[PDB]
Ligand binder design. Structure first.
Ligand SMILES: [Zn+2]
Ligand SMILES: [Zn+2]
Lengths: 49, 50, 39, 94, 116, 56, 51
């Protein structure tokens, strides 16, 4: 109700099980790049790890 | 540093420190109790839109 | 019931001092204890 | 000169006990009214001598449409890092 | 592994070595707070792990009408009512052993007779 | 083999030159070599041979 | 705790190196860069009390 448009959010786990570092990145609308989840959390006001 | 920051001053005062967080809940042993239950049931029953 | 308790009156705030003034809640988000009076 | 009042935060009344109380909708809809709160007695707060139980007793002014007895449930007995601060404008001349 | 968090800023601590005492210290990367470790273990990789075999056991697991019932005996209270379920790890290498939860003492036992 | 638990202990020996920058990544290096020594080590067999079954 | 700036942060995020050093903040604290307001003010105030 109110605008009827759809925006998709994807949280991806980069890397495979044989990798030494698998990070998580999220795709935000109108951002063109997949940001690390920690950066998004800090952008929301939670700075402590 | 920066020489201009564009603050907005206001008159502020700390007028108390919270010591207890409380939750008011009607007593179930009260005569007028169960009128709230009906009121809370009327919340879901209502059809405001026409 | 017996007087094994203490009951204090609960009164409203006069509206003559509640106008042109807003009372908010301040929450320090930290794991230590912050007291702006002593710290 | 632009302000005729101190611009510093007033840490004088901070040592004042305050209770953060969450109210039911039917009670909050008549206690948060600004066309009310003339200084009348909203009721009484009763604490057992040994503690561990508090109860609120409203006056007979509710018109026998809502409960007259309530139980103040302490969701947090010890609270830290929570304070109450006011906000109003400053005198602007001289 | 027992992750440790800082006391002053709540950030994650990291292991560092002090050669002046040949010991292990946990330090913060932003606020300079240190604490000596209680254990010498810092990393653990669990290639074959059993964490999650009984995941989801709660105080009202018996209220679930879909969980099957059994008549097995609980070897901590001697009761016969209980709900049982298979392993909750979705790796396609886990055994079909069952786990029993007693509806009178909340004790979790198993049907395994090989290793237990 | 007779031991109840079968354990390997490995230690990386540092060169004569002392590195002060590698201490921060010292444990980091161990995890890297730990990952490599799990994956790209060929105890025995032919590469790209997943499993073999004997049938009569 | 002496945070960085956006430009400095982005240079580190990009492939300036494989990964940021674990004790980078301690290293840059001694160089003198990346101080705090508290320290930035105390040293100036002491720079006046000395005279
Ligand atoms: Zn810290
Ligand atoms: Zn039992």
């Amino acid at each position: 109700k109110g605008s009827r448009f759809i925006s998709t959010l994807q949280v991806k786990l980069y890397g495979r099980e044989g990798s030494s570092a698998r990070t998580i990145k999220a795709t935000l609308p109108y951002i063109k790049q997949d940001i690390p989840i920690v950066i998004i959390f800090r952008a929301l006001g939670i700075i402590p790890d | 540093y920066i020489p201009y920051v564009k603050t907005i001053p206001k008159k502020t005062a700390i007028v108390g420190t919270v010591c207890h967080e409380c939750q008011v809940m009607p007593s179930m042993n009260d005569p007028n109790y169960h009128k709230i239950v009906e009121q809370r049931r009327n919340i879901v029953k209502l059809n405001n839109k026409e | 019931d017996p007087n094994e308790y203490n009951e204090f009156p609960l009164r409203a705030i006069p509206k003559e001092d509640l106008e042109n003034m807003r009372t908010h809640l301040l929450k320090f988000q930290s794991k230590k204890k912050i007291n702006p009076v002593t710290d | 000169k632009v302000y005729e009042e101190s611009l510093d935060l007033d840490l004088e009344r901070s040592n004042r006990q305050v209770w953060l109380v969450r109210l039911p909708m039917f009670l909050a809809e008549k206690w948060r009214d600004r066309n009310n709160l003339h200084g009348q007695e909203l009721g009484k707060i009763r604490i057992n001598k040994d503690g561990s139980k508090i109860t609120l007793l409203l006056n007979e002014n509710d018109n026998d449409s809502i409960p007259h007895e309530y139980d103040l449930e302490l969701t947090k007995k010890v609270v830290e890092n929570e304070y109450v601060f006011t906000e109003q404008n400053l005198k602007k001349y001289q | 592994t027992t992750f440790r968090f800082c006391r002053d800023c709540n950030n994650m601590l990291y292991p560092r070595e002090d050669k002046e005492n040949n010991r292990l210290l946990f330090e913060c990367r932003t606020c300079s707070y240190v604490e000596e470790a209680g254990s010498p273990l810092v990393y653990r990789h669990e290639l074959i792990t059993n964490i999650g075999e009984t995941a989801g056991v709660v105080q009202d697991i018996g209220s679930d009408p879909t969980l099957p019932r059994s008549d097995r005996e609980c070897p901590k209270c001697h009761s016969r009512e209980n709900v049982f379920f298979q392993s909750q790890q979705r790796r396609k290498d886990t055994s079909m052993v069952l786990f029993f939860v007693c509806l009178s003492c909340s004790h979790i036992f198993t049907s395994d007779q090989k290793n237990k | 083999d007779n031991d109840e638990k079968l354990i390997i202990r490995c230690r990386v020996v540092r060169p004569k030159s002392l590195d002060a920058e590698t201490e921060a990544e010292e444990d980091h290096m161990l995890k890297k070599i730990e990952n490599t020594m799990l994956e790209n080590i060929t105890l025995r067999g032919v590469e790209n041979i997943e499993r073999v079954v004997m049938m009569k | 705790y002496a945070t960085l700036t956006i430009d400095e942060a982005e240079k580190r995020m990009d492939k300036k190196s494989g990964e940021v050093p674990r004790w980078l903040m301690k290293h840059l604290d001694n160089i003198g860069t990346t101080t705090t307001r508290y320290d930035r003010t105390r040293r100036k105030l002491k720079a006046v009390a000395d005279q």
